[PDB]
């Protein structure tokens, strides 16, 4: 018999997309969210990462567009911007400035609260979706361990009354994010511990919101400075992204060993000590609208429920709860869209439980691309904490992995054919392994390499919008 009631824990991007998908296949869906969901673009404590710069890469943007047609146009009408890569960005890599080749990929950029609200407005309006705001999931009900175990429902607590209730379900979806209590819920059902890979470069983030020079959010590119050209030293990075309302979102980041700004008067000096001070020059006369927001959620971690024999029937885990990545590569929301898309494409085949386990295996395969990309890039940072069994990571020459990464970067910034393939991998539209293919290696040697840029490739009319001259 088919499932008739599904419960989705968490109403952020992973839970909202899964709720919309499951409503097409299940008679009734209940969404359990700890926060009150605002009706206007507004931050909330359940998604504290929304304070920092967010790119929706073309992989997630297309997956969301095919699930919810019109979403992209609604975002743009609300002030979001479609950044073309590498065309609409002034980017400094460890190998030099990126030539602004005609765009081969894109990313939608906006405030994360606007993007969350726009998606919620297009997904949660179905008649068979019930949203229980200000309701907290406390534990799962059912049985675990041995064989034959299965999750029957979830205990929820109403936060305005304090009363608890048993919410029975044929299917429970954990989408509660990086701070998820899944390991406690599992152990309370007698389920053994899950396998977990971790690659933790100790990345932290400091963000301020600025009023951009008038017109810059439309006629000035995004700027990204990534300083990693030495490997015995921690990485230090910085981005300035345009968002709706004529505002600049500036996010500074560093790996373990470096020092982030903890006060407002340390923000611009950090940008002045990157490999090029262009982010400081842009933000020197810009009006700050916020204090400095911080984040320490920069580890790469992946659970493998698809490997656990004692995985209970009727339970799935998606989003940051299943796996989370270093935000610098900006794949979290695309991974959430992949989880919902995989449920949509595999649900009917997986029912008629071999279905719950088949869905979880399909979900695990869909999140491999953002995992192996972020972990490959972070594993070689100095003082990185590594605890993973992935043979693509652990059994690899460390000199050769670094040298090859440098060669990939050197080709992408100055070779059109190499840049196109790299943006495919960067946009999560091609696996990381494609950079080791015969196709990429032949493109890397055969393609032309343009001369090295000795200054940031701003067009003069872009410098005129922000009131600068000669880089």
Ligand X SMILES: Cc1cc2nc3c(=O)[nH]c(=O)nc-3n(C[C@H](O)[C@H](O)[C@H](O)COP(=O)(O)OP(=O)(O)OC[C@H]3O[C@@H](n4cnc5c(N)ncnc54)[C@H](O)[C@@H]3O)c2cc1C
Binding-site residue positions for FAD: 12-14, 33-34, 44, 49, 54-55, 112, 136-137, 320, 333
Residue 101 in contact with ligand Y7R, rule: CB under 6 A: no
Nearest to 151 by CA among 136, 167, 134: 167
**What CA–CA distance (Å, rounded) separates 374 from 299?**
9
Give the shortest CB-466-to-ligand X separation in angstroms. Answer: 23
Among the listed residues 286, 324, 328, 340, the single contact to ligand Y7R using CB under 6 A: 328
- Dist CA 127 CA 124 (whole Å): 8
User: Is 320 a residue that touches ligand Y7R (CB under 6 A)?
Assistant: no
Give residues with Cβ within 8 angstroms of 440, minimum separation 6: 408, 418, 421, 434
Asked if 353 interacts with a second copy (CB under 8 A), we say: no
In the complex, the smallest distance separating the C-beta of residue 78 from a second copy, rounded to whole angstroms, is 30
Residue 384 interacts with ligand X (CB under 6 A): yes or no? no
Of positions 205, 267, 371, 458, contacts ligand X by CB under 6 A: 205
- 177 touches 320 (CB < 8 A): yes
Is residue 30 a contact partner of residue 6, using CB atoms and an 8 Å limit? yes
| Binding of ligand X by 176 (CB under 6 A) | yes
Pairing verdict, β 5-9 and 81-85: unpaired
d(CA 42, CA 222): 23
Q: Is residue 419 involved in binding ligand X (CB under 6 A)?
A: no
Closest CA to 303 of 195, 217, 422, 398: 195
Distance CA 98, CA 236 (A): 18
Three-state secondary-structure class, residue 386: strand
Does an H or E element contain 91, and which? strand 89-93
Q: Please report whether residue 407 would count as binding a second copy according to CB under 8 A.
A: no
Q: How far is the CB of 328 from ligand X (least distance, A)?
A: 8
Residue 164 bridge partners (DSSP): 157
Residue 295 makes contact with Cl ion by CB under 5 A: yes
User: Can residue 431 be called a binding residue for a second copy (CB under 8 A)?
Assistant: yes
Q: Which is nearer to ligand Y7R, 36 or 103 (CB)?
A: 103
Alpha-carbon dihedral angle through residues 302, 129, 22, 140, given to the nearest 10 degrees:
50
Torsion from C-alpha of 45, 48, 50, 51, nearest 10 degrees? 110
Binding at 12: pick from ligand X, Cl ion, ligand Y7R, none (beta carbon under 5-8 Å per type): ligand X
By CB under 6 A, name the one of 53, 89, 283, 351 that touches ligand Y7R. Answer: 53
Neighbour-count burial of 431, counting CB atoms closer than 10 A to its CB (0-12 exposed, 13-18 middle, 19+ buried): middle
Q: What is the DSSP string of 301-369?
A: EEE-GGG-TTPPBTEEE-HHHHEE--GGG--HHHHHHHHHHHHHHHHHHH---HHHHHHHHHHHHHTHH
Minimum separation from the CB atom of position 367 to a second copy (A): 13
Q: Is 1 in the site for a second copy (CB under 8 A)?
A: no
- Applying CB under 5 A, among 35, 36, 43, 48 the residue interacting with Cl ion is 48
Binding mask 369-388 for ligand Y7R (x = CB under 6 A): --------x-----------
**Cis amide bond preceding 86, omega within 30:** yes
Shortest Å distance, C-beta 181 to ligand X? 6
Q: Which of residues 321-360 bind ligand X (CB under 6 A)?
A: 321, 327, 330-334, 336
Q: Which residues are annotated as a binding site?
A: 12-14, 33-34, 44, 49, 54-55, 112, 136-137, 320, 333
* Chain positions contacting Cl ion, by CB under 5 A: 48-49, 295, 297
* Chain positions contacting a second copy, by CB under 8 A: 2, 24-27, 348-349, 351-352, 354, 368, 391-392, 431, 433-434, 436-439
* Chain positions contacting ligand Y7R, by CB under 6 A: 52-53, 55, 94, 205, 224, 226, 228, 237, 239, 251, 253, 327-330, 377
* Chain positions contacting ligand X, by CB under 6 A: 9-15, 32-35, 46-47, 49, 52-56, 136-137, 175-178, 205, 295, 297, 319-321, 327, 330-334, 336
């Amino acid at each position: 018999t088919r499932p008739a009631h599904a419960v989705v824990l968490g109403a952020s991007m992973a839970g909202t997309l899964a709720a919309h998908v499951l409503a097409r296949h299940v008679d009734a869906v209940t969404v359990v969210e700890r926060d009150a969901l605002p009706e206007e673009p507004q931050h909330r404590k359940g998604v504290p990462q929304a304070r920092h710069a967010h790119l929706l890469w073309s992989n997630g943007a297309r997956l969301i567009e095919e699930m919810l047609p019109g979403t992209t146009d609604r975002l743009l009408a609300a002030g979001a911007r479609r950044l073309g890569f590498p065309e609409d960005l002034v980017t400094l890599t460890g190998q030099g400035w990126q030539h602004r080749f005609p765009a081969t990929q894109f990313a939608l950029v906006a405030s994360r609260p606007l993007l969350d609200l726009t998606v919620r407005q297009q997904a949660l309006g179905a008649d068979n979706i019930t949203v229980r705001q200000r309701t907290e999931a406390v534990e799962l009900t059912g049985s675990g361990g041995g064989s034959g175990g299965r999750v029957t429902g979830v205990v929820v607590r109403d936060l305005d009354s304090g009363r608890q209730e048993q919410l029975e379900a044929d299917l429970v979806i954990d989408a509660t994010g990086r701070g998820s209590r899944l390991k406690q819920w599992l152990a309370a059902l007698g389920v053994p511990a899950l396998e977990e890979d971790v690659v933790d470069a100790g990345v932290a983030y400091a963000t301020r919101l600025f009023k951009a020079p008038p017109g810059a959010t439309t006629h000035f590119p995004a700027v990204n400075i990534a300083a990693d050209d030495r490997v015995r030293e921690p990485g230090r990075f910085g981005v300035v992204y345009p968002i709706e309302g004529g505002r600049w979102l500036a996010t500074l980041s560093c790996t373990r060993g470096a020092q982030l700004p903890t006060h407002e008067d340390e923000f611009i000096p950090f940008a002045e000590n990157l490999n090029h001070p262009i982010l400081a020059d842009l933000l020197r006369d810009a009006e700050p609208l916020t204090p400095v927001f911080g984040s320490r959620s920069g580890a790469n971690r992946r659970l493998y429920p698809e490997r656990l024999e004692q995985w209970p029937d009727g339970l799935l885990v998606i989003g940051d709860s299943l796996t989370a990545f270093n935000p610098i590569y900006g794949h979290g929301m695309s991974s959430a869209a992949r989880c919902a898309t995989t449920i949509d494409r595999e649900f009917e085949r997986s029912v008629q439980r071999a279905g719950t386990r088949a869905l979880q295996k399909a979900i695990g395969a869909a999140v491999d691309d953002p995992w192996i990309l972020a972990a490959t890039k972070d594993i070689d940072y100095v003082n990185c904490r590594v605890s993973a069994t992935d043979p693509r990571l652990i059994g690899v020459d460390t000199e050769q992995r670094l040298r090859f990464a440098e060669a990939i970067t050197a080709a992408s910034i100055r070779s059109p054919k190499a840049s196109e393939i790299v943006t495919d991998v960067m946009s999560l539209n091609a696996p990381q392994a494609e950079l080791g293919s015969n196709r990429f290696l032949m493109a890397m040697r055969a393609d032309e390499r343009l001369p090295e840029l000795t200054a940031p490739p701003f067009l003069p009319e872009e410098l005129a919008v922000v009131g600068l001259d000669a880089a």
